[PDB]
Write a protein that binds this ligand. Sequence first.
Ligand SMILES: [Cl-]
Lengths: 108, 106
Amino acid sequence: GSHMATVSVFPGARLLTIGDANGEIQRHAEQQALRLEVRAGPDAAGIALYSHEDVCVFKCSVSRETECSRVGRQSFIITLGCNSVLIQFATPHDFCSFYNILKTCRGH
Amino acid sequence: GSHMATVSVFPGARLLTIGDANGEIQRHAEQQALRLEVRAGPDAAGIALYSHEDVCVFKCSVSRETECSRVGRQSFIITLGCNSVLIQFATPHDFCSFYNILKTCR
Ligand SMILES: [Cl-]
């Protein structure tokens, strides 16, 4: 307040919000063409995704304790509370860059 | 032989194969009625899913290194090489029992 963040930006991400309270999988929300911004900090990575109308569709902090995983070649799932969010990157290269930031922040 | 060991058994599990090749979740598998068995050691937990006919449809070892995560309140994703599977338990209670057993090796 004020501050200047320098973020890694991954344009053209897809976000799928999911649950499993129906004994299968539920899709709660699904959104394309989001701008993902990642703020690399000491012990956590700040994640936020924005629509072209500046809507902040999802925001969280990923730390060593966060339940999360690579999914396939270019996606990442984060589970906070009862729902999970799956982020699908535009390319495997983008995912790999993102993952390396997260591994650094989480102490791996 | 011989020694004693524990086998933790979770009937009514299911396995979905997550498929990425053109976009959406591509079900290479969507198998109902499996029993998941965990054979846990100090540093890795052996997981195997068996059909009613005792066919092993999926197996792996879970350790500190394994790329995996809780999904929702009763599911678990495991990613190995390029491929991911989603295991779904019969109840959130089953999932929590399973998750707790993995805490040592993870
Ligand atoms: Cl910064």
